[PDB]
Amino acid sequence: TYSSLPDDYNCQVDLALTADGRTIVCYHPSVDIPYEHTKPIPQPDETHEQILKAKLEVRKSKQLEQGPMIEQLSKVFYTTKHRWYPHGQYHNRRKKLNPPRDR
């Protein structure tokens, strides 16, 4: 129990100074989650797109109106309606076509 911090979450931490004292030795082997502390995968019986269709169900007046459509979209993602509004041509053209990607 030499370590001053709990070792049960991330990894076992063993801090030791070399005999000469010129170096500090740290051993950090990882710790796995106990089987008994985990739940089994749900036995009762998937692409995220499928959930989106069910979440954004078309129920009233066939396809919903623009405002209600934004409201339904806003509720699902906990976002404001202002985000969903479109933007004009001037700003749309300004966007860089090919942003650089490295690695």
Binding site: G21, R22, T23, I24, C26, Y27, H28, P29, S30
Partner: protein
Amino acid sequence: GADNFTLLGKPLLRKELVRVEATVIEKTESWPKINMKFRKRKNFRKKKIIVNPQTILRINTIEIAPRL
């Protein structure tokens, strides 16, 4: 550092323990850097550029031995 252990200098490790080597890739300079001044009647011909020199290095290898 390693997967399950690390070594710390106090403030540096002994030269014997660790050997690190790298290679020089390119020598270049920097893109222009504006150096305009904030003086009344600034004028359009009152500015300077820096374009400092530059160099490129690629890491090659790291060598260690059990010399604790």
